[PDB]
Design a binder for this molecule. Sequence first.
Ligand SMILES: *CCC(=O)Nc1ccc(-c2ncccn2)cc1
Length: 278
Amino acid sequence: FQKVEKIGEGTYGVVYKARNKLTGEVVALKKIRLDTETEGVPSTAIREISLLKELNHPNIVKLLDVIHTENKLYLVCEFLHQDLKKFMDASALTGIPLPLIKSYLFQLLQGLAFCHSHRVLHRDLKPQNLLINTEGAIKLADFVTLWYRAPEILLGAKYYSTAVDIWSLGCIFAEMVTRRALFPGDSEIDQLFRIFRTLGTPDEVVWPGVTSMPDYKPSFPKWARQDFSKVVPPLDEDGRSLLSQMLHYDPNKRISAKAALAHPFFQDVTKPVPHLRL
Ligand SMILES: *CCC(=O)Nc1ccc(-c2ncccn2)cc1
């Protein structure tokens, strides 16, 4: 295995496309600088990470191997050619076809239903972690980030649930439809305010228990909720109906991935292929 292209860089480290010179096998290799002063990887970290290696689903990017030294953690994952962020950039003018948004959302909910039923939460879902191929598949990888963060997390809940992934996916769904991020916060308060201005300022009625959240403030400005026809033009009523349930404030009223799969939005789901130029 040999580095053939750099496909990502950030504060975490770097991701390469790597090719086996003999077999042609291609993998994604994510190289992570530990900064633990030669102590290696926290046992918690590797155990959490190693648990991910158990996820075996066609809509989850397979964690193939973990390799770590005193200095570095290397994750080796299955490789796919493009991410959803890149694709939505490339589809800025005409948008992603609705049948393809439909297919991708159905596929991602199958993957989350699997993870969630095996007690695993992604917690950092975003368009950049969603990978696509020229076969019409989309898969969850990497198990601002702000823009997709559930309100219970922004308000400081100590324990969060699988419902935080549904929220993120709902923001991604909206973004595929409108070709702009739904809640593009310029600060952590702006993030909240952007949510409140769309869904309404939460209170104990709409969200029982919101008042116990560490960051909850009675002094929040009071906005009224907007109709979803304004939030996601021009998605049909089936789509908006599903989107609304994925974006409920109360993580207990938020739709589950298994329930979302039965929604009538998916009645006419098929498998289009996108046109990519690699
Ligand atoms: C599974 C570990 C991991 O981080 N994997 C991963 C795979 C793929 C990418 C990627 N691939 C193509 C384009 C953009 N990003 C990042 C990380």
